[PDB]
């Protein structure tokens, strides 16, 4: 998950979450 918004981690890409914006480095 991404621990600044909780949004499933399947929608990161590019090195962001997708929804927030947040770092990759947000994702646990």
Same mark, same amino acid.
């Given at each position: &998950? !991404? %621990?600044?918004? =909780? $949004?499933? $981690? %399947?929608?990161?890409? =590019? =090195? &962001? !979450?997708?929804?927030? =914006? $947040? %770092?990759a480095?947000?994702?646990?």
């Amino acid at each position: &998950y !991404c %621990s600044d918004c =909780g $949004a499933d $981690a %399947s929608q990161v890409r =590019g =090195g &962001y !979450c997708t929804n927030c =914006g $947040a %770092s990759a480095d947000r994702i646990r």
